[PDB]
């Protein structure tokens, strides 16, 4: 207060120069927040897990000797066959 404003302004400018800080005495909205804002892209994209996972489909390629039975697909196929037997199968999809 008693100390003049010019001295404090010089101190502020010079200190901002030393520590690689930008000095904006005018108060104008330069928008430096956007440049200095951290990126949230990778964390947001990693919400559901990394997309590269070993799938049952891949097993036949990886281990030819071992023959893996996925029970859920067998159940689904047998259910489709059961509906196929009684004529309750899905109508054929229209060809374009």
């Amino acid at each position: 207060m008693n100390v003049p404003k010019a001295r404090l302004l010089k101190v502020a400018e010079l200190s901002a120069k030393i520590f690689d800080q930008n000095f904006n005495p005018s108060g104008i909205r330069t928008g430096s927040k956007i440049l200095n804002e951290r990126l949230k892209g990778p964390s947001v994209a990693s919400y559901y897990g990394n997309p590269d996972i070993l799938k049952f489909r891949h097993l036949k390629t990886l281990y030819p000797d071992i023959e893996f039975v996925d029970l859920e697909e067998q159940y689904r196929l047998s259910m489709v066959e059961a509906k196929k037997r009684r004529g309750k199968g899905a109508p054929k999809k229209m060809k374009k």
Binding site: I34, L39, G41, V44, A45, Y47, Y48
Partner: protein, 113 residues
């Protein structure tokens, strides 16, 4: 033809439904377009620059598709696909969080005393 969305996005590794797929699409496209959107916002919100550049940046921001907006990302349960009552500490709805905590799938979680 082959895929609902303009760009090819890999399938999530867990439970899948339509809304999870839309969420994943918007999330990945946000990852890819974040830097462009931030640069456009900088040029739009920087009053130092000429007004014409600011208006051009604003118009280009308005022209972007919905799958690039940050706000449109909503956190969903990764086990049931629900969008409400989702705990971000586990990304699970309160019910799935309860079952996983009881079964011990969540590390460190316990019953309150």
């Amino acid at each position: 033809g082959n895929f609902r969305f303009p760009i090819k996005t890999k399938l999530p590794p867990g439970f899948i439904n339509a809304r999870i797929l839309r969420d994943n699409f918007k999330r990945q496209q946000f990852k890819e377009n974040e830097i462009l959107v931030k640069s456009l916002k900088f040029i739009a919100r920087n009053m130092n620059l000429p007004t014409k550049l600011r208006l051009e940046a604003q118009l280009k921001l308005n022209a972007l598709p919905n799958y690039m907006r940050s706000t449109q990302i909503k956190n969903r349960c990764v086990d049931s696909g629900h969008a409400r009552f989702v705990l971000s500490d586990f990304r699970l709805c309160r019910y799935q969080f309860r079952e996983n905590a009881l079964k011990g799938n969540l590390p460190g979680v316990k019953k309150g005393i």
